[PDB]
Structure 1
Amino acid sequence: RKGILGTKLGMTQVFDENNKVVPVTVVKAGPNVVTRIRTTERDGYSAVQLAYGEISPRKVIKPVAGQFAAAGVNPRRHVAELRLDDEAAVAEYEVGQELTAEIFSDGAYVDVTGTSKGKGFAGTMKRHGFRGQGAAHGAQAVHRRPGSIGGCATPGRVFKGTRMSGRMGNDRVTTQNLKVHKVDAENGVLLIKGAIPGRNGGLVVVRSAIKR
């Protein structure tokens, strides 16, 4: 169970060893420094905290700067954890270890987490995949509307988890599996097959797949 932070760099297409087209989403996982290693004695779990992306020193908050000063590391844009199973896996990390995208090895499977695109208050049709009412044959002002939302005098209420209308996207999501076509060691980019969540240039956590 290895992992890496990176960014979504946008999509392209690349041709196979057997001449098929695979569509590939290009991510660039840059050099990530492990800042802090969460340990089972003090915390009650095992995890690794990874730092990513260049930031100016003056932008950094003094609370945030002192944490990087404890690590012995130049401060970074984003930081996040890889939760990992058992105690044994944190044995092979040291604070200030600068890991790169070379580890993943061609033909692996991943999870590739990342926050989704916000769609911005879509109701009913777009959000849940409801069917609207008919466009003709009488239909007065109901063409995209939800219809009924409940029974009658019993129960005399709407149930929790009824499907209505509200702000859609910016969900954390996951792709699952999603084959790594090619690790490029120089440049520091991974060609992963298929779509990966989020906008172009959003933060993305690639780790090896739990289902595989």
Structure 2
Amino acid sequence: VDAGIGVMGTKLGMMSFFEEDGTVVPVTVIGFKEGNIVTQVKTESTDGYNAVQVGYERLRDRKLTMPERGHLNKAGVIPMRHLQEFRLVSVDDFTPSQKLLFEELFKEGDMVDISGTTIGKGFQGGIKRHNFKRGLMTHGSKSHRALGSIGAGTTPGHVYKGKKMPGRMGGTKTKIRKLKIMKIDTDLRVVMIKGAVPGKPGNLLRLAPAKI
């Protein structure tokens, strides 16, 4: 569930916005390759919950399968690469046909929480995934940076599960909460959103008001 419907943009680098007061604040910059359009709305009766399915990044028909283009076509909308729905407190008042929305809204809700696929760091070790420590680098020591011990002796008789081994670190989406919006420019349809948001510039970036 989320508080309200949200949009999804794209990370576009960062910069600073000199506040006229003369204080320096970092910002990132959110952009829309193609505009968010509703492409579905599901009720509590016809389906199990309530949500609106928005889409992003319009693309050529080739790039996209037949089940997709049929799904998009049924609602009478343009193509679109990315496609996600916001489950919404069951108050939906949306015609699933191309209610192109906008940021007439986030400037009022001056705190926004976004969902971004972080960047991916391969198969990282113990010392960095889980913030372990490391043995002495000198003094005859011979186990630096290694995961060290695992468990106890005969009784536990194995390694408690959920142990903090090494493994793959990044690549899964993450929120970031109560991150406040900041002076926006509708001619360029760009957002100047303070803070630092998941992902190197150019990944999809859900964007929806808080759930305080």
Supply the AA of the counterpart residue of 2:10: T
Give the gaps of 5 or more residues in structure 1: none
Matched residue, 2:101 = 99
Matched residue, 2:172 = 171
Partner Cα separation in structure 1 for residue 13 and residue 86 of structure 2: 24
8 Å Cα contact 1:49/1:80 also seen in 2: yes
Q: Determine which structure has the larger helix proportion and give its number.
A: 1
Partner Cα separation in structure 2 for residue 92 and residue 55 of structure 1: 24
**Post-superposition, which runs of at least 4 consecutive aligned residues in structure 1 deviate over 3 A?**
none
Matched residue, 1:6 = 9
Please tell me whether residue 18 in structure 1 is matched to residue 14 in structure 2. no
Q: What TM-score comes out, normalization by structure 1 length?
A: 0.94
Partner Cα separation in structure 1 for residue 29 and residue 192 of structure 2: 5
Question: Are the structure 2 counterparts of residues 106 and 181 from structure 1 closer, same or farther at C-alpha, using a change threshold of 3 Å?
Answer: farther
8 Å Cα contact 1:52/1:79 also seen in 2: yes
Give the gaps of 5 or more residues in structure 2: none
* RMSD between superposed Cα atoms in Å: 1.4
1:102-135 CA-to-partner distances (Å, cap 9, x unmatched) read 4311671011101111001011111111001001
Match 1:79 to one of 75, 78, 83: 83
What aligned pairs does 1:97-136 form with structure 2 within 5 A after superposition?
97-105=99-107, 108-136=110-138
8 Å Cα contact 2:130/2:164 also seen in 1: yes
Matched residue, 1:204 = 205
Three-state SS of the structure 1 residue aligned to 2:184 is strand
Q: What TM-score comes out, normalization by structure 2 length?
A: 0.94
Could you tell me how far 1:17 is from its partner in structure 2?
3.5
| Identical aligned residues as a percent | 43
Q: Which moved more, 1:21-30 or 1:158-167?
A: 21-30
Question: Are the structure 2 counterparts of residues 197 and 79 from structure 1 closer, same or farther at C-alpha, using a change threshold of 3 Å?
Answer: same
Question: Are the structure 2 counterparts of residues 100 and 43 from structure 1 closer, same or farther at C-alpha, using a change threshold of 3 Å?
Answer: same
8 Å Cα contact 2:119/2:199 also seen in 1: yes
1:71-121 CA-to-partner distances (Å, cap 9, x unmatched) read 101111100011112x22x11444211112343116710111011110010
Partner Cα separation in structure 1 for residue 129 and residue 174 of structure 2: 15
Partner Cα separation in structure 1 for residue 73 and residue 108 of structure 2: 36
Partner Cα separation in structure 2 for residue 4 and residue 93 of structure 1: 16
Q: How many residues align?
A: 208
Three-state SS of the structure 1 residue aligned to 2:192 is strand
Question: Are the structure 2 counterparts of residues 176 and 22 from structure 1 closer, same or farther at C-alpha, using a change threshold of 3 Å?
Answer: same
